[PDB]
Design a protein around this ligand. Structure first.
Ligand SMILES: CC(=O)N[C@H]1[C@@H](OP(=O)(O)OP(=O)(O)OC[C@H]2O[C@@H](n3ccc(=O)[nH]c3=O)[C@H](O)[C@@H]2O)O[C@H](CO)[C@@H](O)[C@@H]1O[C@H](C)C(=O)N[C@@H](C)C(=O)O
Ligand SMILES: Nc1ncnc2c1ncn2[C@@H]1O[C@H](COP(=O)(O)OP(=O)(O)NP(=O)(O)O)[C@@H](O)[C@H]1O
Ligand SMILES: [Mn+2]
Ligand SMILES: [Mn+2]
Length: 463
């Protein structure tokens, strides 16, 4: 094996239950490091880590860092966190989540997946292709890979597939061999001082982390990405529906919640793809995945097998089941989409699978900052469903911003006159409210990045 990180005996994670944090912790646990961590919440993730031998503390206290050789910190952690403050006082190395991810990547063949939307999905897809190819990859995904039942896996090969978060610009730590950029739209704009040009510059800097011989795989259908190509200074391979795409998608058809399409490769090789998840957005994600795999020299059959049986990522167009309600049989689908674009493509994918029956949405806005920044776009997109239940903003640690709450969204949606939303501030009433507005054959989308998935789970179990 590769020698242990020098003098690193115990790695302490502040926010260890995190989607990215937990996977990093699990990789290192399985490499033989002592793992400790704290989290304000105990759930399936922390329980799994504890059962595997991680020392897990619920709630934060300065004593929890005892023994730590290094402290890894989620960007969710406040500056005045007692563990964080004490670590700095005691001069224990304190590093970002992504810096520890970078260390996992350092001596590996890193395939980093960046972009505004679809990172978790694309990472899961590449992970499954490489697994299918018998390449035994390590992966660290920012979400549950359904065919793994977990977010991360330690393989014995040198491959690492990893999701690369731009939200705090922390992906600049990463030194990959191949970098995917799925798309670029304004999100997390506070980090970039509301300046989209600073986000662009940051992604260019990220791509400049590639070695001179490294590969950037970028969506041809994104005009921002295409504008940036001259700045990359590394080989760029593109994918998408665009006539100019190196890996070009043609003849896309969605049947039910499966996609069918052809991909045309740079050497004019034609590959007929069956994708086990719906929507053109997922065809894009899967073509990023196919492009990476083809450029790596992976055979078609492995790519196609993995895509045809792709079970998805948790919470990403995730079918929870069918339920017989007093007013009809309904389908409950959970989706992580939290940016207007994501909500949009999800609605469209649902429409192309359902057809005659209604799309009912339970939407929980994530962040006041995001609601403020993209208010008008949310109003437009949320008006495209047939029935809309609005939940209160999931604060995600943010103080309320005036005019950027669910009541304000409801008022503005109501003004458009396409749908009349019902605000459900008391989620214990959600079941009763739904049952009143449910019709036979409804597809219910539980939509958002916050506690909406927990709420939909509790709703599904009660049903
Ligand atoms: C804050 C941030 O940078 N989070 C990104 C990061 O995930 P990470 O593993 O650091 O944590 P996380 O999944 O956000 O969860 C934070 C964890 O810290 C815990 N927590 C939070 C505050 C605190 O004071 N103490 C504490 O212990 C929470 O209980 C939770 O278990 O890397 C992941 C992979 O790249 C990203 O998916 C993830 O986005 C989160 C999930 C997110 O909510 N993203 C969007 C929707 C957003 O914040 O707007
Ligand atoms: N290529 C895409 N373009 C636009 N929306 C997408 C795309 N792929 C997926 N989505 C939508 O975005 C949601 C989140 O997808 P996901 O793969 O988790 O993106 P992400 O980039 O990992 N998000 P995040 O880590 O929170 O910044 C999905 O549930 C879909 O609603
Ligand atoms: Mn993600
Ligand atoms: Mn994001």
């Amino acid at each position: 094996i590769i020698p242990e990180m020098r003098r690193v005996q115990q790695i302490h994670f502040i926010g260890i239950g995190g989607a990215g944090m937990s996977g990093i912790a699990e990789i290192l646990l399985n490499e033989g490091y002592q793992i400790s961590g704290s989290d304000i919440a105990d759930g399936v993730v922390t329980q799994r880590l504890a059962q595997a031998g991680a020392k897990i503390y619920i709630g934060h206290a300065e004593e929890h860092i005892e023994g730590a050789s290094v402290v890894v910190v989620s960007s969710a952690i406040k500056d005045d966190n007692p563990e964080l403050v004490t670590s700095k006082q005691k001069r224990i190395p304190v590093i970002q989540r992504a810096q520890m991810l970078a260390e996992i990547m350092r001596f590996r063949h890193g395939i980093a997946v960046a972009g505004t939307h679809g990172k978790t999905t694309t990472t899961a897809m590449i992970s499954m292709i490489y697994t299918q190819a018998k390449l035994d990859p390590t992966f660290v995904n920012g979400g549950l890979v359904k065919s793994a039942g977990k977010n991360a896996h330690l393989g014995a090969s040198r491959y690492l597939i990893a999701e690369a978060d731009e939200s705090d610009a922390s992906f600049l730590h990463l030194q990959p061999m191949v970098s995917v950029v799925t798309n670029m739209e304004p999100d997390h704009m506070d980090t970039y001082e509301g300046d989209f040009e600073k986000m662009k510059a940051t992604y260019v800097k990220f791509l400049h982390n590639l070695p001179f011989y490294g590969l950037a795989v970028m969506c041809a259908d994104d005009p921002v990405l295409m504008e940036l190509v001259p700045k990359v200074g590394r080989q760029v391979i593109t994918y998408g529906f665009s006539e100019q795409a190196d890996y070009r998608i043609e003849d896309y058809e969605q049947t039910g919640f499966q996609g069918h399409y052809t991909v045309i490769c740079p050497n004019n090789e034609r590959i007929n793809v069956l994708l086990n998840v719906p929507g053109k957005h997922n065809a894009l994600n899967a073509t990023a995945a196919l492009a990476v795999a083809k450029e790596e020299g992976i055979a078609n059959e492995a790519i196609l097998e993995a895509l045809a049986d792709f079970q998805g990522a948790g919470r990403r167009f995730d079918q929870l089941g069918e339920f017989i309600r007093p007013n009809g049989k309904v389908r409950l689908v959970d989706d992580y989409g939290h940016h207007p674009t994501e909500v949009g493509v999800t609605i469209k994918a649902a429409r192309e699978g359902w057809g005659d029956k209604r799309i009912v949405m339970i939407f929980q806005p994530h962040r006041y900052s995001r609601t403020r920044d993209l208010f008008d776009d949310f109003v437009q997109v949320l008006s495209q469903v047939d029935a809309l239940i609005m939940l209160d903003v999931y604060a995600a640690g943010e103080a309320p911003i005036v005019g950027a709450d669910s009541k304000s969204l409801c008022r503005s949606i109501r003004n458009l006159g396409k749908v009349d939303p019902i605000l459900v501030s008391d989620t214990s009433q959600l079941g009763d409210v739904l049952d009143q507005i449910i019709q036979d054959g409804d597809l219910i989308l539980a939509q958002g990045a916050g506690s909406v998935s927990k709420i939909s789970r509790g709703l599904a179990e009660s049903w």
